[PDB]
RNA sequence: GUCAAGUGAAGAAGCGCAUACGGUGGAUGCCUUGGCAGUCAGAGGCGAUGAAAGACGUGGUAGCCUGCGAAAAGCUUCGGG
């Protein structure tokens, strides 16, 4: 959620969390072209993700 | 049981008229998400903080509309339920 990202992390430590998610988004646009990808509902959840963690950076 | 003479109903290839059913065709009837003109109020501007108008892109699958813009049918906050 937000309200756990406004606590403090930083702007390091939530900057490392960015590099986590894109691995996640990496691997389910893998599956998907490949034929092994059920979860439909996990592809369009990390987008919705990565949009938070840039939104408390560009403003604090 | 005979000839001669007189008379002339049927028969329709196909058509005409009337009715009875159909086919084609989309009128009439009834109906409206759309318009049309007024009355009374607003508000009369948008743009170098990048406009009016668009191209391309965005959805778990596929074209087009409607929304958005690599943070892309959305993100964070207050308020209403």
Same mark, same amino acid.
């Given at each position: 959620?937000? =309200?756990? #990202?406004?606590?403090?992390?930083?702007?390091?430590?939530?900057?490392? =969390?960015?590099?986590?998610?894109? $691995?996640?988004?990496? =691997? #389910? $646009?893998?599956?998907k072209?490949?034929?092994?990808?059920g979860? *439909?509902?996990?592809? *369009?959840?990390?987008?919705?993700?990565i949009? $938070?963690?840039?939104?408390?950076? =560009?403003?604090?």
């Amino acid at each position: 959620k937000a =309200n756990e #990202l406004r606590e403090e992390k930083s702007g390091p430590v939530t900057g490392n =969390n960015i590099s986590h998610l894109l $691995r996640d988004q990496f =691997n #389910l $646009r893998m599956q998907k072209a490949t034929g092994q990808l059920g979860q *439909s509902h996990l592809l *369009s959840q990390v987008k919705r993700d990565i949009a $938070r963690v840039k939104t408390v950076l =560009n403003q604090q």
